[PDB]
Amino acid sequence: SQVLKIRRPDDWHLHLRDGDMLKTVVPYTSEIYGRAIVMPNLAPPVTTVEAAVAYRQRILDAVPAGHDFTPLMTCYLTDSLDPNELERGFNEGVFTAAKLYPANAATNSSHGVTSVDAIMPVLERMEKIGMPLLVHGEVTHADIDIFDREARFIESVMEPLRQRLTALKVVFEHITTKDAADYVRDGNERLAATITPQHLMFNRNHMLVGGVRPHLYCLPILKRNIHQQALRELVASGFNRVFLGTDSAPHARHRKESSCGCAGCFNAPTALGSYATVFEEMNALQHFEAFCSVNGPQFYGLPVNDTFIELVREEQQVAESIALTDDTLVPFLAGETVRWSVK
Amino acid sequence: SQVLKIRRPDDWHLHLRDGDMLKTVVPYTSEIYGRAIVMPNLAPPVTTVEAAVAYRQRILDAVPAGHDFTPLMTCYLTDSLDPNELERGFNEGVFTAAKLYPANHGVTSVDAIMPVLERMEKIGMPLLVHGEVTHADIDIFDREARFIESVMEPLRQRLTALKVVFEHITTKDAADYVRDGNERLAATITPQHLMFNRNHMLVGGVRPHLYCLPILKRNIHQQALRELVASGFNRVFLGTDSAPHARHRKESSCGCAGCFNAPTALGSYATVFEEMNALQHFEAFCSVNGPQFYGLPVNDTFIELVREEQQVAESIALTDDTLVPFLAGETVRWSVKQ
Ligand SMILES: NC(=O)N[C@@H](CC(=O)O)C(=O)O
Numbered sequence: 281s282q283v284l285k286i287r288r289p290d291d292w293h294l295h296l297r298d299g300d301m302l303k304t305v306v307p308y309t310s311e312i313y314g315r316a317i318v319m320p321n322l323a324p325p326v327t328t329v330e331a332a333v334a335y336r337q338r339i340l341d342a343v344p345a346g347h348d349f350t351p352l353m354t355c356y357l358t359d360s361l362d363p364n365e366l367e368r369g370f371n372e373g374v375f376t377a378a379k380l381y382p383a384n385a386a387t388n389s390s391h392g393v394t395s396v397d398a399i400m401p402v403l404e405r406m407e408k409i410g411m412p413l414l415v416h417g418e419v420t421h422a423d424i425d426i427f428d429r430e431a432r433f434i435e436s437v438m439e440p441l442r443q444r445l446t447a448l449k450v451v452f453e454h455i456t457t458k459d460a461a462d463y464v465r466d467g468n469e470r471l472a473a474t475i476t477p478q479h480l481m482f483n484r485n486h487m488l489v490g491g492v493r494p495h496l497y498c499l500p501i502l503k504r505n506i507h508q509q510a511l512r513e514l515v516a517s518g519f520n521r522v523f524l525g526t527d528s529a530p531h532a533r534h535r536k537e538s539s540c541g542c543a544g545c546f547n548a549p550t551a552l553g554s555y556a557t558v559f560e561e562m563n564a565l566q567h568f569e570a571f572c573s574v575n576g577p578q579f580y581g582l583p584v585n586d587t588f589i590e591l592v593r594e595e596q597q598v599a600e601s602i603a604l605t606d607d608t609l610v611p612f613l614a615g616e617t618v619r620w621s622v623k
Numbered sequence: 624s625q626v627l628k629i630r631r632p633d634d635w636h637l638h639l640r641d642g643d644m645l646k647t648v649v650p651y652t653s654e655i656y657g658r659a660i661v662m663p664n665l666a667p668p669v670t671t672v673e674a675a676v677a678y679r680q681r682i683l684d685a686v687p688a689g690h691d692f693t694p695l696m697t698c699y700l701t702d703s704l705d706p707n708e709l710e711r712g713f714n715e716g717v718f719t720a721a722k723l724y725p726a727n728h729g730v731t732s733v734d735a736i737m738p739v740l741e742r743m744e745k746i747g748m749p750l751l752v753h754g755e756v757t758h759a760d761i762d763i764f765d766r767e768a769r770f771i772e773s774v775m776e777p778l779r780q781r782l783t784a785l786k787v788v789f790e791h792i793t794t795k796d797a798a799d800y801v802r803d804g805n806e807r808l809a810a811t812i813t814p815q816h817l818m819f820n821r822n823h824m825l826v827g828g829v830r831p832h833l834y835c836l837p838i839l840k841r842n843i844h845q846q847a848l849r850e851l852v853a854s855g856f857n858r859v860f861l862g863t864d865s866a867p868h869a870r871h872r873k874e875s876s877c878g879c880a881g882c883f884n885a886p887t888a889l890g891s892y893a894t895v896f897e898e899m900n901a902l903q904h905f906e907a908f909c910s911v912n913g914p915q916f917y918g919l920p921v922n923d924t925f926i927e928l929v930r931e932e933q934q935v936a937e938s939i940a941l942t943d944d945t946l947v948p949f950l951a952g953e954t955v956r957w958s959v960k961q
């Protein structure tokens with residue numbers, strides 16, 4: 281059976297949570313990926329150097345003996361963040377990047393951004409010092425249809441911001457639309473993107489035909505098939521400013537399978553093999569390694585990993601669930617037979 | 624303070640289920656509505672007069688003493704249904720209508736059931752249509768509009784005397800189609816498709832209790848539906864599509880489609896018509912338009928709605944698990960007096 285040997289990958293978009301959940305989920309990342317961009321949306325969010333240092337240590341504490349795994353921390357951008365605090369964290373090697381979540385005029389200044397215009401001082405500082413901005417590019421105005429929120433962000437925020445701050449480096453995280461695919465494809469060397477396995481593998485029909493499937497419910501929402509196909513064609517093209525970002529985003533089963541299910545797919549256990557399946561189906565396996573292991577490092581200005589892992593094309597069964605201290609976690613593709621697995 | 628007295632309504636699109644669920648859910652309908660169109664998608668479906676007779680009795684058994692409720696039964700169309708069985712049930716006053724569910728025991732094509740539809744047209748039996756195509760490569764939000772072009776309009780062009788109700792319409796496409804139709808075409812609209820759009824199901828979390836078929840659409844469609852009922856157009860009428868499922872069948876890795884809206888629909892419709900400055904058309908929608916299309920007398924009793932905020936129960940007890948009502952735990956602006 282067939283083997284794909286690649287330089288050890290990294291995960292450029294990850295949620296590790298905290299406490300007991302962190303302890304459970306970290307190994308699924310640390311056994312496979314050399315590094316991961318660790319998102320800062322804890323409760324409360326990671327908005328200071330001190331919090332990020334402490335969080336980094338909790339993550340490191342949870343890494344099993346012998347895994348060579350480095351968490352790359354992020355700062356959650358808020359209205360009240362001091363640009364001097366962000367800069368110090370960047371300078372000290374604590375913050376690899378800063379994350380911008382959608383603006384909301386009603387957000388507490390300690391927990392988020394009211395409008396992009398309101399945090400220009402901090403965005404200018406990142407431009408000045410060369411710190412990459414990671415963007416969850418949606419506008420969340422109550423009068424915008426949810427399937428439109430990504431496209432509206434491009435027009436309303438992304439293009440204006442990049443015109444205003446022409447040296448700013450930006451990753452358009454977890455892109456989900458042809459709009460974003462074209463936008464990133466047509467951008468310059470300062471603009472990149474991550475794509476999750478679920479947005480390559482599925483479209484909204486998979487979440488809604490035959491039943492509603494909360495384990496496919498994530499933000500940005502799965503879009504119509506034309507968008508799925510655009511994403512697939514983008515990674516398959518060999519375009520070298522798109523790279524692996526799982527957006528692995530774990531929630532307890534009872535929080536997913538409820539009257540108001542949380543957004544996020546726990547895909548760390550099955551993501552790498554899921555990407556291999558997509559690249560294989562697109563006849564584009566020659567671009568697979570770069571996506572997983574080269575493009576991200578290149579964009580972030582970091583070294584490519586010098587060790588290797590192998591995927592084997594032999595069928596395995598994904599666990600139905602993964603025990604937590606309380607409740608259980610349902611992994612992405614739970615119970616399914618998958619095509620590629622790590623040797 | 625404000626009181627609104629209407630002719631007693633009917634529900635022209637209802638799911639009552641069977642067994643213990645039936646016992647639980649019938650009183651929420653029977654206490655209010657004079658009649659309801661009882662859908663036949665049981666497991667197995669109601670495809671014979673004999674099955675429809677026994678089901679009707681199970682329903683009547685579960686109606687509390689003192690409720691004057693009459694269930695109007697329907698036949699589940701299948702590809703091989705004998706037209707004589709359908710006609711016999713009609714002639715015996717058992718079947719009021721027949722329901723067309725696209726496969727995915729449902730109907731695989733209109734061509735396979737032409738002789739059944741031709742008999743319905745001859746005898747004047749209305750055809751109730753779940754108007755969605757189901758091909759795997761058609762996006763779920765497009766399935767209603769595609770049905771209109773590819774099935775509905777060809778069908779109506781072929782059987783020009785057939786009376787059709789376009790059930791639970793959800794789109795501007797269907798709203799315009801019905802608005803511009805002739806007197807042999809009508810529609811029902813649920814409370815959920817008037818009150819919400821897909822954002823309410825998907826923004827801030829996924830809400831399976833708002834997941835139903837046809838799927839909630841974009842806001843421009845919700846608005847079209849609200850304008851249609853508010854216009855006074857007299858070939859749209861109340862059909863709740865109350866479609867109960869136990870809580871943990873809704874709240875699961877693959878949640879069932881349907882809203883249990885019988886407890887709150889009437890009040891919910893009142894809120895919509897009020898918001899649309901269209902309470903003058905509310906009675907007709909609830910209590911006149913349906914009977915007129917079906918050729919049945921209007922009800923001869925009256926009820927009162929009062930604009931006093933009632934809190935909707937968080938859940939309703941079942942033998943096993945619970946049933947979560949539409950708008951569970953929320954407030955409804957209108958309640959039924961006494
Ligand atoms: N509408 C729904 O979402 N559910 C109905 C089926 C139907 O009306 O098609 C049901 O019977 O559960």
Ligand SMILES: O=C1C[C@@H](C(=O)O)NC(=O)N1
Binds near residue numbers: 545
């Ligand atoms: O934007 C996000 C946040 C993430 C999470 O749960 O943290 N889950 C998602 O689905 N995407």
Ligand SMILES: [Zn+2]
Binds near residue numbers: 454499500
């Ligand atoms: Zn995000």
Ligand SMILES: [Zn+2]
Binds near residue numbers: 293294295319527529
């Ligand atoms: Zn994320």
Ligand SMILES: [Zn+2]
Binds near residue numbers: 753790791836837
């Ligand atoms: Zn239906």
Ligand SMILES: [Zn+2]
Binds near residue numbers: 637
């Ligand atoms: Zn129905």
